[PDB]
């Protein structure tokens, strides 16, 4: 079939990161665009591993909150649409995407066309240190285990395409 | 009307076989596992009957001032169960032995990489130790052999990497070590474990602390009465 | 003194060790170079099957692990030494694998995704995307375990002789 | 029910123990006697515990063999109606009674009766040092994990013991 | 469609590789017939082709005054074609070469069950002499490899006794030596010559007067082109 | 690589250094010796049709030829050593053998003169009738051959493991 199941990272040339302050939620951590010609579906129960840290490469604060949020074609958020709300503390890094049994997942599905957007938030208190991508990554989904799940990608078939413009 | 028994270095006879190989590559018979005649016809099933072989080989060294670490060992060494330090492990490593003060020996620490180790005791200059460390490289299989001495053959032509048994914990369900293949025994006939690798093996070394049989082979199989 | 015949079907494993594969080490930042390099073991068909585990013990020149960033893949190639496209299994990182059990319990296991076959020539590679900062790549103290040959879990993988209407219909790619 | 699911130790009154010397396998190492009133049932697929240990608290030689063998009443070996052999170092005395997965189990069920016995047959190699199970002891069976398998015992009820003396 | 080769020596290829036996009484590989990328397969069989074996060895001596008797040379000696006297061999029974001198010698007489012989020159004291007689005991069959270094089966597990070979006059047609089982080739897989025996076997001896080979395997077989 | 699979009738050769018979010194002046005992392998199944070659290259401890007069006989006997009588296959002169070619040429060779089958447990042993002026007799620098398997000439014996009828009727004696 068609459908490629494949996970995502920072590195691929359809995701931006972004530095970002110690004080401020709305700025664009990291910008997923649609990639122009395929479609993406997420299904719910999906993995991530946001394995984010400082500009020392000390991790965070585990008291950071960590969104992901489904936007428009603009980069406007939605405020509906979250898939993520928690925090960094829940994530033991050494085995976060190691180990099913501490794997945090997601909680709904998703779907992106060949413009929409995906942006990940990052709530941090005064004293942090930042956010420095150059060493901090994100990895999303899993290909391997029979545990957990993966991404769809696809091009372009009718029926499923006229179906999922349906939003 | 069969039961499942245990073949393994002594069993159920005082007439199987162990020997150690050569130095020149080219493989030997290590065990001779021979059927008495207190049975019928004994039994093997691959992927069914667990089987157990912890290898154990020999080194000598002596010391001076300075020796705390001992050297490449020509041996490659694996973390046992992925684990490194030693008393996390279903077994150690490596043991040692002073002939001169005539003890054990608590070992400190390793590099597996490099192949060495660090021990605790600082050895005296003239003094003597012996080393008992697993066997690294290596390839195995069973081969039978008529009650003539001839050769029928062996078992699933795939020797098996011997680092293997080294690497899961063999003493946890599941994880065993099986292999595959099936054969049966008769009377006076005898199947063998052969292997070929650069280091020699050894059993029965007397001044050995923690058991009077370093390293064994143990295989269940089934039995007719 | 009976053994019990066999079918064709070998059920084993697959590692650097075996005389049909090749190891190389690698310099820092080229996913290019083929750090393994099976071969068709001319006459004999191999086939995995799909959900078959991998444990790739890759290590530095100073036994420590890899960085995490790095990528591993797993491709099919031509009888000449060139990759398809499709046909791949595995694309994913170490910082997956828990080198201390990755072979040792099923919930830490890694699988492939599709089936995959081999003729008597065919060639399977692993390329191993890294970054510059990396300690290259050390296949003497390194090497790979793919497939379970041994436990009740895991699967194994085929390896059978030529036989008539087997292959007529493995040829069918 | 007249059923009742229990283990079985060393420090109970239908069971014997015996200090062994070094390499006399011959010698019943433990013995188990039936009750007199009561019958006892095994099924295959049971752990064993058998903690053997020397005079001074060390753990014996993992080479040595142990058996569990049923005798007649006389006390003689069956030979055949072996539920166990194997090495005590396929154990590990640390946990050898609390995960399944290191548990190890019989390969036979059994069934005793008001005069069966039971011995506990110990090869044991010729440097070791005896086996005292004054210090050592021996834990049969659990009823307490969904994992696991107790042993059933019941007073004389009539048709299932009628039964049960067709061996 | 097939024709009819001689596998040798030298052979086809010069792949065929020769290697000595080890001293410990123990089955070796003593020849490897490989098979080349030239043919397709290559064939066997007993009880239709001829095969041809004279095994010789090698011992060495010194010199002393009143010397012209060696000793017994380690070997269970057999007269040819159950004929004893060297003029009238098919092939020498054993020769001689004096280092110093550089000269082959020929004999003057023999005591086959005592293994002993008298030479025709007395060598000076404090010379060196090198001796090539035929081999005695031992016993050998065929084994094959794949393409794995996988052994897969014996060929009629049934090794022929070396003397044999002596006793036969080889040459004789009917009289020929042909051996039982049967074997196909492939491309890349081997076959060896295999053998156990108390003493080690030589070759490429270059002291030695009647060519470049001091013993030969030959073996007329079927072709597959 | 093929290998050819066999029916269970192997054709071999018999001699004294095989273990499933055993020598024996002898003095110079006993025809009850049992020089040679040939026992049942425990197992398979030995054939002996009649017309079989036999070299005894019998000398004494120095090697030498031995006297005219004397003979040789050869003799089955029962599972608990002790022979038959009957079954017995060869009695003459040793004034006949030429040992220098007797196994070489048809016209000087000879054979057994009747058949013969072998059990598991059966056993045949061979005996030497000598007068008053010979030196002994020694085994080991003397030894026996049976049959031929290697040339066109004389005849084989067979060896079989267990088929089901073949033992059935094979029990008749």
């Given at each position: 079939?068609?459908?490629?199941?494949?996970?995502?990272?920072?590195?691929?040339?359809?995701?931006?990161?972004?530095?970002?302050?110690?004080?401020?939620?709305?700025?664009?951590?990291?910008?997923?665009?649609?990639?122009?010609?395929?479609?993406?579906?997420?299904?719910?129960?999906?993995?991530?591993?946001?394995?984010?840290?400082?500009?020392?490469?000390?991790?965070?604060?585990?008291?950071?909150?960590?969104?992901?949020?489904?936007?428009?074609?603009q980069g406007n958020p939605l405020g509906d649409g979250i898939v993520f709300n928690d925090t960094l503390g829940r994530?033991?890094?050494?085995?976060?995407?190691?180990?099913?049994?501490?794997?945090?997942?997601?909680?709904?599905?998703?779907?992106?066309?060949?413009?929409?957007?995906?942006?990940?938030?990052?709530?941090?208190?005064?004293?942090?240190?930042?956010?420095?991508?150059?060493?901090?990554?994100?990895?999303?989904?899993?290909?391997?285990?029979?545990?957990?799940?993966?991404?769809?990608?696809?091009?372009?078939?009718?029926?499923?395409?006229?179906?999922?413009?349906?939003? | 009307?069969?039961?499942?028994?245990?073949?393994?270095?002594?069993?159920?006879?005082?007439?199987?076989?162990?020997?150690?190989?050569?130095?020149?590559?080219?493989?030997?018979?290590?065990?001779?596992?021979?059927?008495?005649?207190?049975?019928?016809?004994?039994?093997?099933?691959?992927?069914?009957?667990?089987?157990?072989?912890?290898?154990?080989?020999?080194?000598?060294?002596?010391?001076?001032?300075?020796?705390?670490?001992?050297?490449?060992?020509?041996?490659?060494?694996?973390?046992?169960?992925?684990?490194?330090?030693?008393?996390?492990?279903?077994?150690?490593?490596?043991?040692?032995?002073?002939?001169?003060?005539?003890?054990?020996?608590?070992?400190?620490?390793?590099?597996?990489?490099?192949?060495?180790?660090?021990?605790?005791?600082?050895?005296?200059?003239?003094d003597t130790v012996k080393v008992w460390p697993i066997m690294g490289d290596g390839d195995v299989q069973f081969r039978?052999?008529?009650?003539?001495?001839?050769?029928?053959?062996?078992?699933?032509?795939?020797?098996?990497?011997?680092?293997?048994?080294?690497?899961?914990?063999?003493?946890?369900?599941?994880?065993?070590?099986?292999?595959?293949?099936?054969?049966?025994?008769?009377?006076?006939?005898?199947?063998?474990?052969?292997?070929?690798?650069?280091?020699?093996?050894?059993?029965?070394?007397?001044?050995?602390?923690?058991?009077?049989?370093?390293?064994?082979?143990?295989?269940?199989?089934?039995?007719?009465?």
């Amino acid at each position: 079939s068609a459908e490629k199941q494949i996970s995502v990272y920072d590195g691929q040339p359809f995701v931006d990161e972004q530095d970002v302050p110690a004080d401020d939620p709305n700025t664009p951590a990291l910008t997923i665009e649609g990639p122009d010609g395929y479609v993406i579906a997420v299904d719910a129960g999906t993995p991530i591993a946001p394995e984010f840290r400082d500009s020392n490469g000390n991790k965070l604060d585990p008291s950071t909150r960590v969104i992901v949020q489904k936007c428009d074609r603009q980069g406007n958020p939605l405020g509906d649409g979250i898939v993520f709300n928690d925090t960094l503390g829940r994530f033991d890094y050494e085995q976060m995407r190691t180990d099913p049994d501490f794997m945090r997942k997601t909680a709904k599905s998703l779907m992106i066309d060949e413009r929409e957007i995906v942006k990940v938030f990052v709530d941090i208190p005064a004293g942090a240190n930042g956010y420095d991508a150059d060493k901090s990554r994100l990895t999303l989904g899993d290909d391997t285990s029979d545990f957990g799940k993966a991404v769809e990608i696809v091009d372009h078939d009718e029926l499923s395409d006229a179906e999922t413009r349906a939003v | 009307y069969t039961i499942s028994h245990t073949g393994g270095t002594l069993g159920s006879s005082k007439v199987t076989t162990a020997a150690n190989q050569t130095s020149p590559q080219r493989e030997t018979a290590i065990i001779g596992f021979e059927c008495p005649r207190k049975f019928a016809e004994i039994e093997y099933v691959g992927q069914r009957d667990s089987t157990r072989f912890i290898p154990r080989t020999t080194e000598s060294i002596t010391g001076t001032a300075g020796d705390d670490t001992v050297v490449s060992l020509t041996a490659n060494i694996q973390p046992v169960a992925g684990e490194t330090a030693i008393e996390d492990q279903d077994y150690p490593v490596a043991v040692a032995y002073n002939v001169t003060q005539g003890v054990q020996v608590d070992i400190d620490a390793v590099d597996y990489a490099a192949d060495e180790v660090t021990l605790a005791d600082n050895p005296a200059d003239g003094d003597t130790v012996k080393v008992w460390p697993i066997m690294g490289d290596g390839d195995v299989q069973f081969r039978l052999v008529n009650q003539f001495g001839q050769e029928e053959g062996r078992v699933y032509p795939w020797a098996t990497p011997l680092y293997r048994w080294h690497d899961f914990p063999q003493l946890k369900r599941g994880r065993e070590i099986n292999l595959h293949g099936s054969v049966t025994w008769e009377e006076n006939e005898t199947v063998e474990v052969l292997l070929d690798a650069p280091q020699a093996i050894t059993w029965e070394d007397s001044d050995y602390p923690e058991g009077q049989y370093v390293s064994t082979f143990e295989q269940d199989v089934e039995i007719t009465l």
